[PDB]
Write a protein that binds this ligand. Structure first.
Ligand SMILES: CCCC[C@H](NC(=O)[C@H](C)NC(=O)[C@H](CCC(=O)O)NC(=O)[C@H](Cc1ccccc1)NC[C@H](CC(C)C)NC(=O)[C@@H](NC(=O)[C@@H](N)CCCNC(N)=[NH2+])C(C)C)C(N)=O
Lengths: 99, 99
């Protein structure tokens, strides 16, 4: 699709068997999902933005379907106010900015 | 241009006669620039990021060039980690997200 930016670029994702709404975020290096259980091992990480930092759990090799497109990579899980799809997974679905 | 996302989508902007670097940020409603002087009065705004809320100075009808494209609109000034071009000005330069 071509997504205009009049409104927040929200899409449906599937992760860990659950459907969620997530924000396609070119200003995020990483993907961060509201706290949930994911399979396998994790390690703690600090991620920052406006307002400072939060502690998250890092899971590697996680598969997410993003608007019907399958991607795999690192997914961080923690107290984010919004589900965020960052560049590490946007690249995998071939996402580009165009103007 | 068509911008892939393997690196941060950084561009050159020009605002108040100064060249700066800023991030094209589909995950931002608003445009936030690190502290600088802008003409006119400002008004208060609280903005939220992944870490919490911060107060910024809101300046309306600011002229800004973004990767060679002219925009005129609201610019928030405050402590952002990185200068960010949000959807309010991304729409003005005709930017879309494609995959
Ligand atoms: C129209 C105006 C509405 C009024 C106002 N609106 C807002 O506050 C809206 C919701 N906030 C936003 O739009 C803000 C940008 C600020 C702004 O636009 O004002 N967007 C954001 O903060 C979005 C995520 C988000 C989206 C919506 C809500 C909350 C959060 N991320 C933008 C931010 C830009 C960064 C360069 C500073 N990116 C990040 O924070 C990402 N972090 C990173 O990419 C790493 N660099 C951080 C890790 C560093 N440490 C390390 N690697 N060890 C994070 C998503 C993983 C309000 N008060 O409600």
């Amino acid at each position: 699709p071509q997504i205009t930016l009049w409104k927040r670029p929200l899409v449906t994702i599937k992760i860990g068997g659950q459907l969620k709404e997530a924000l396609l975020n070119t200003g995020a290096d990483d993907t961060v999902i509201e706290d949930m259980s994911l399979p396998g091992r994790w390690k703690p990480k600090m991620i920052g933005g406006i307002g400072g930092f939060i502690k998250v759990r890092q899971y590697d090799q996680i598969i997410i379907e993003i608007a019907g497109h399958k991607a795999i990579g690192t997914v961080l899980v923690g107290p984010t106010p919004v589900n965020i799809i960052g560049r590490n997974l946007l690249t995998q679905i071939g996402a580009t900015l165009n103007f």
